[PDB]
Amino acid sequence: RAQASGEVAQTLTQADQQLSAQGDQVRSGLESSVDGLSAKLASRILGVDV
Amino acid sequence: TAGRVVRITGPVVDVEFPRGSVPELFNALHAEITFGALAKTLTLEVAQHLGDSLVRCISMQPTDGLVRGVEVTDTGASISVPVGDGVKGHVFNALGDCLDDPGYGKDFEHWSIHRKPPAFSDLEPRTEMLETGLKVVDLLTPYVRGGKIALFGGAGVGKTVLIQEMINRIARNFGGTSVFAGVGERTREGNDLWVELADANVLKDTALVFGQMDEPPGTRMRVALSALTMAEFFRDEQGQDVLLFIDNIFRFTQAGSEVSTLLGRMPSAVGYQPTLADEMGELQERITSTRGRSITSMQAVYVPADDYTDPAPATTFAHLDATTELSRAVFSKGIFPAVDPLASSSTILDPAIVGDEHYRVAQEVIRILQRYKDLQDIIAILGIDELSEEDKQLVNRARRIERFLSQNMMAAEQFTGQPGSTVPLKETIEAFDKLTKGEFDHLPEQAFFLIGGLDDLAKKAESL
Amino acid sequence: TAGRVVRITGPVVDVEFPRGSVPELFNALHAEITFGALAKTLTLEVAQHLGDSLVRCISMQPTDGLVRGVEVTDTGASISVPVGDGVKGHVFNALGDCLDDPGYGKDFEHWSIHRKPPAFSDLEPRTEMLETGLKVVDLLTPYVRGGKIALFGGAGVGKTVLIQEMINRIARNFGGTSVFAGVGERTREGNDLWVELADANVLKDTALVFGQMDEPPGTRMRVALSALTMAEFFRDEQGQDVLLFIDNIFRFTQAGSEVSTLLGRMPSAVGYQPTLADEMGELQERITSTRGRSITSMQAVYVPADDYTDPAPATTFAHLDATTELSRAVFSKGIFPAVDPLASSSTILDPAIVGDEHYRVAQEVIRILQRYKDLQDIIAILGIDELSEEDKQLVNRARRIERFLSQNMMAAEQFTGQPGSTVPLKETIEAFDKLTKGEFDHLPEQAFFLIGGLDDLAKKAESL
Amino acid sequence: AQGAQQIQLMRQQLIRQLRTGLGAEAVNKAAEIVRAHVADPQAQSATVDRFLSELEQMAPSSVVIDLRAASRQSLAALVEKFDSVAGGLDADG
Amino acid sequence: TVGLLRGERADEAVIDLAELAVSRRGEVVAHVSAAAELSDAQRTRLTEVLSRIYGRPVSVQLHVDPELLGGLSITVGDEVIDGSIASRLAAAQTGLP
Amino acid sequence: TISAADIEGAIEDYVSSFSADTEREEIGTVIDAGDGIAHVEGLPSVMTQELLEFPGGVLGVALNLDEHSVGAVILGEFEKIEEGQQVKRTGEVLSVPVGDAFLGRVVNPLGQPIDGQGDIAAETRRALELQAPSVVQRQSVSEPLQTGIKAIDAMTPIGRGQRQLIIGDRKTGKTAVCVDTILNQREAWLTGDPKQQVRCVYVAIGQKGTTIASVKRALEEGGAMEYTTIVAAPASDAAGFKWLAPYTGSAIGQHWMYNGKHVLIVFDDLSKQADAYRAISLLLRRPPGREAFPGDVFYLHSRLLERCAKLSDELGGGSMTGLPIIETKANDISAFIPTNVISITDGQCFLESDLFNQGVRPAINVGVSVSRVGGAAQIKAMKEVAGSLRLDLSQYRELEAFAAFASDLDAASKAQLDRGARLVELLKQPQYSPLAVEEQVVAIFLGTQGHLDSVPVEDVQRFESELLEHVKASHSDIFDGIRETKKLSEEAEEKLVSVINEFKKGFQASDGSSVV
Amino acid sequence: MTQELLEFPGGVLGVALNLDEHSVGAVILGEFEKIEEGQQVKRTGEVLSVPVGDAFLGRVVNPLGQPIDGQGDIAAETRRALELQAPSVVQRQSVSEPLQTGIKAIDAMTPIGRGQRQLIIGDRKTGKTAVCVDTILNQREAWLTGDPKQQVRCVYVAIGQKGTTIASVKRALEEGGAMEYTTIVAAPASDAAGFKWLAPYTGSAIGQHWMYNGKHVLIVFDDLSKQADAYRAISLLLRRPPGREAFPGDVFYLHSRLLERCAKLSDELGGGSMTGLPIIETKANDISAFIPTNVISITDGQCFLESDLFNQGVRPAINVGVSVSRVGGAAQIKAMKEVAGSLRLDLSQ
């Protein structure tokens, strides 16, 4: 029980470094996409091709 | 002519009417709820007039989904409930709507629930004993014809069996009927009772009225007055004797206190409504005999905190004439119908009202059982061998009296297949007179269980 | 643009604003007092909107000398408190200005007093035991490192001595930071804390906040939220673990009850404000420790009329991991620190967390003291000579156990003259294990009183 | 198995953060381009027209409505007495 | 009216007089708000549609305000149309996953 | 792993769906606000209990409808309210989403996820205030709800459909008795049969947040988070969420019930339901009655509890079982809320702190607790054993004072004293260890058949726990036979007594004596 | 202003406690009989104040600081506002020096120090007044030294006492020469609920004026139950909704801001102090009642005088279980700490 619990605790630190590294990359990729998605959203707000 | 809903607060609704068309108080008003999942016809009872043609009402059904400004139609009569022989064998809510088959009974005559008790000139000028034919009841705690009887007990003490018994007694001996008022009854218990009275096949002579706990305190208050208005028709127009059960009369007091609080009136001692001793009176004074016909009542009464000084029991025990108490310590001995012979009491047990012989035999039976009740501790702790010979001869009689109170009641015919007995009063006073003098001590306890009358004791003794 | 005062009643002030300028709930307003020795700027917190551009507020300084029609300026934000590292080693009033060095906080980062508690996703239960070296506390009510811990008690049962002993035991050793909130505590014991913390070195890392019982209800409400907004910065923006001491957390709910009648809320049971549980809950939930960032809370709760049924104690008990419940009935026996062994409790006292050796001994000690408390009424009338040999042996163990739960605390130097002592958890367990098995039944009863550990118990038994 | 669930919780925490955080840039960037479109009145008079044609497409009239009873009935009676009086008196009366 | 105000607020009183006056004129009033005034023909359209949303003819009081940075809002009785671009952007911000 | 396609697709899918119906609707304005209440003028077509939405995204319930203005209690984010705010009405009375996706989730009273584990796949929606099953739609209670507590299932049985009250003082184990009940059901749930599968809702009202996390962690460790939903109204949430929390737990429960599942609801605890409704009602200036509660508080609890029932075969034969908890001040049972719930419920397990201290844990007062359902909720094998147990404990409670003088007591009752002291030990039980029915029938058998009479009192629980481990190893066929036939057949009884004697020869007492 | 003195035309005064949107709700501080509707009121321009000075030594005064002993007008040094704030946590100093009562059962067992509050709670006729008057009498041995760093001045505040009881206290002090250094504030039973409410505050103002000037002061309040009843009467006539036991909501703030204003100052404020002995009369001998458990929680210790100890010859009747002083042996001379150091715990055992 103590060994399996200790391995889960260290595994959560391994996930935190993976997800923060991949999250910082993927938020940069999405900043390109969101400018394109925003132009569609403004056309839905107005009802015209802004 | 119709009114408008003008304020809503919880179960309380205020309505406004055209100047000339204001309804009389205690009229019933109908209002529609039109949201799909909550679609209803809401029934309002008029409580007060606030001026400006406004009328203060309480709702007999949940107000949830009601909208301001909706139309309200006055029915021009009080809450009204169906009356006739065709009421028997059906289950009704307080408003006179059937639960067993919706829309039944629309064609019946409808009576107002709010109507006066008998005029002073109509009352019977003396109490008369009711010969119910149960040994323990007729001897130790005689019931009063058109009186009220408190009942105490719970589950695992035969209470539903005593109810089936007393229904059979009225139908078969007096040619009467019963009405049952579920005044704030658990919905599960109301279904267990409806099935139990159907399986017993007694339902065919009983009208069931249920005010469930699920519904606002206007309904749990008005159910008792609804059931009593069905019993009043059977007394007055059909000319039958009637037995009105109320379970439980405490919830009629409580529901009255909660309606008085929703109406914002100042609460009295320990929080009850200021009308309490009148509001209970308008129900209890109405249960009575007139012109040779009678409404007997049995009333399960809860006591809060077990104290008989609290205004809810202390108002209730002013009215009722007899007190039957069921005991698990008597049921566990096999002694059906499990009426405790010492804790139960009656106010008609006096030498002036019942014969001098009956009073003597009742005082002797109480004395013998009171000695045995004192001795039970010595028996349990030290055994019968620790007694003398003078008191061991008393216990030899007390064991047999405690058994001989037991009866093959008609409610047991569902299981035992043998019919139930109905002993004359003049036999049971002889049987306990002979038994207290010891003329049967040479017979074993098994000869006295479930026995009925004295000529039956002779037939079981020669069998054993 | 700004408003004006319309109505004044004690601590409650109503203000009126131009049509669009009406301030939000919980903004800080300012008003000016101009008479002589009372001349000050007054800060004033928004409680309600009354309609027609009226707003109702609660004053922080006393309203004496305020005048109708004076100008009121909305600051556009809530009351704000200085937060940061340089807060440690200073004493603040509720409003966040330093009493021992005026103006000191003006150049810090300021935070709003009011914020929502941490979201349910961020909470995890805390299950590491805090050792304190008090016999009864470490045995029967073991404390939780990162939990919420409390003292309860009636007026004058020594709560302010026990909390000053908890500062002295825990915060000395503790390597993090600490905060003390004086919520309606008596000012003298606030100064006896400030000077004791300056005579030791502990003030170098301690932030003190004082809103003492001389101040009006506005500050007695907001001082708890102010000192908590200092602790919530040390928990959140720094992750450095923190001790939060509160004395007395009842005064928060009391001050709410003092304004509630003037704010125009109908009073509930025993005169408390109806918001009580929601108003206290929005404070108590903020004190929680979220995953990986500990607050250890230690809070003293007053108990009106010693009545542990009273709504304020009875609400507060839901919020706590360990409760050390003091009692006047134990204090009257001289058993200092006067914790009730039977009412006091902890959630961490499970054999999976403390180990079975602790759990067995704790449950045996409680069994003995419970059987003794049941026998006291027999012993007071019929005398100890009447009991069974096993019961008389148990009473002689219990009377020794009760006294061995007393201790010479360090803060009780002025109460007893003797210096203070700390008893290890293992020695505490071994000593009560021996006591429950009678291995000290040959000692005189007075040897165990105030003594501390087994080496001291022996030395006092040799003194006799 | 609970460790694998807590990794999935931290992944879903990041998914939640990024989808809403993207939407917050999308909406504010849509407000920047809308604010630029609206800056001259050729957009306003067209936009009220897209709305007004939408309102001609909106459902036709469905409500007839378009001070306590004793004072209200008294005011109605008073207004009926006024209507007869002023109908003769009006031109200088 | 200023002679007999007795407890009311003056701006609410003069707005109640105008409502009374147009009701006596056989019409109803809607309060309309936009960033800029519409053209006269566009106001005739607004009248032509409201005269189909309600039984009586509707007059309009245009309360120009810059906050409704595109579109307009219409208040009549105590029912409204939330037609402004500023309301659309608030609904986009709040309704987003 | 996280990808740009899914994050772009979700945002584009909202963006391309984003529009407004522009529909004509009624609006009111906030005229007043204080302390968790707002008053709204206008809204001529609002209905009692309609969800109002305020402009800060916060919601209110429109619980009072005066002549001039609506009175609305505000759900949660009260600080965001100001005079002159526009109030929109949603077109519906209070509703909650329902479905199987709620299993293992923690939710706020509106059915929004609060555990942070993403959005919930709502299956259907229900109004909070639909009619309870009427007296013609029900069926008699006749199936056990196995609690797995010896002191309950042997003396105050719970049948599925019953409403059983766990009334006690604070820190007497009320939450521990209900967590043991929810944990016990895993032994049924691992089977596929919908008749045996019980599904559990735990409704936490006014707990602190870490106490709800502590219960969740205690259900995770037992695996009960496969089949249980937690409705969380922690003490921080506004009085409106505390007042709705029982109703939304019931409104989730009813959807599983009406589909022919079996449900268990625990309400923890209805004293804080009542105290939250009193707060709302007194702020709305509604008239106070006794103990400051508004008039309708019996109806508040009753319309909640009377929705627990067993349905007939025509409604798929489902059921819902209520375990309401309440807390009693200084052990009184004459206060307003305890008196109301004791009259509404079918049975009442009084827990008492005096028995909790004396060692009798869980602290069921077997001398005053009762169940109006009784034997209809017990399997035949349990009636065959437990039928004398209440009588034995009543005779022992009378005899208890003679323990000082047992030499002089007559032997026919000295045996009843030695029995009763062993039954009071046999009824003790450690927390988070619920016993399956097939193991508790063998536990009560040891005492009631008198096989335990030769064991010294201090060794009884160790003897019970050692025998149940022994039988569960060498002779599981006794337990299989009990479970599969529901009857303790004479072959299983003769096998069991042979194995009890064979175990006694292998046992030792804490004083070192033999027990044979 | 809020709590401004009003002047009514009979020369009687009042205080403006409620300021409504259109009227001022005032309490009359004197003979209310002379008031008529429609007569004039003048404002005074002064927040509620009292005259103060050392000229008050030996005098009996109305709560407004004017004399009733009949010995002519008082040469007051200044006015002082009744509601000046208590000395804050930074201005106070630790209690370290004793207030000698000369009663063994107090001075050894539950000491009183300069700047402590010690509640003399008890039932009717148990010695409450007798302990306090004996305490004021014992100080003469110090006063005869003429040294301002050890002599104690006294104030005795009679609230709701009958006039012959106050005249008995006065001559019981004159028998011991204590009227050389005592002031009496008298709100006798006849006087309107304004005076009966106000008497403790004017006592605290006359006291504070000597305290901040570096003198040592002792205040006796006799008894705060009659102030709490007078504030209940004032609040209910003003129609404020009552809280628990029909008291005003803020009956705690009536007593807290009275008793917190007496403490020991730092040497940076002359080092003067004020010592408070409030009295509480508990009905039916229960200490666990609303008002007594407030004042037990505000003060620093209890001398609970119990009638069923008084009757059995234990006089003065201190219940040694409940009685305590929370400053304890920090407020005793070294010899008394060595000799008596455990005596309360030994007797409670």
From Swiss-Prot, chain D:
It comes from the Bacteria. Keywords: ATP synthesis, Cell membrane, CF(0), Hydrogen ion transport, Ion transport, Membrane, Multifunctional enzyme, Transmembrane, Transmembrane helix, Transport. One of its GO terms (molecular function) is proton-transporting ATP synthase activity, rotational mechanism. It is found in: Cell membrane. One of its GO terms (cellular component) is proton-transporting ATP synthase complex. In the N-terminal section; belongs to the ATPase B chain family. Binds 2-aminothiazole antibiotics, which are antitubercular agents. F-type ATPases have 2 components, F(1) - the catalytic core - and F(0) - the membrane proton channel. F(1) has five subunits: alpha(3), beta(3), gamma(1), delta(1), epsilon(1). F(0) has three main subunits: a(1), b(2) and c(10-14). The alpha and beta chains form an alternating ring which encloses part of the gamma chain. F(1) is attached to F(0) by a central stalk formed by the gamma and epsilon chains, while a peripheral stalk is formed by the delta and b chains. F(1)F(0) ATP synthase produces ATP from ADP in the presence of a proton or sodium gradient. F-type ATPases consist of two structural domains, F(1) containing the extramembraneous catalytic core and F(0) containing the membrane proton channel, linked together by a central stalk and a peripheral stalk. During catalysis, ATP synthesis in the catalytic domain of F(1) is coupled via a rotary mechanism of the central stalk subunits to proton translocation. This fusion protein includes a component of the F(0) channel (subunit b) and of the F(1) subunit (subunit delta). Two copies of subunit b and one of delta together form the peripheral 'stator' stalk which links F(1) to F(0). This is ATP synthase subunit b-delta. The gene is atpFH. The chain holds residues 100 to 198 of 445 of the full protein.
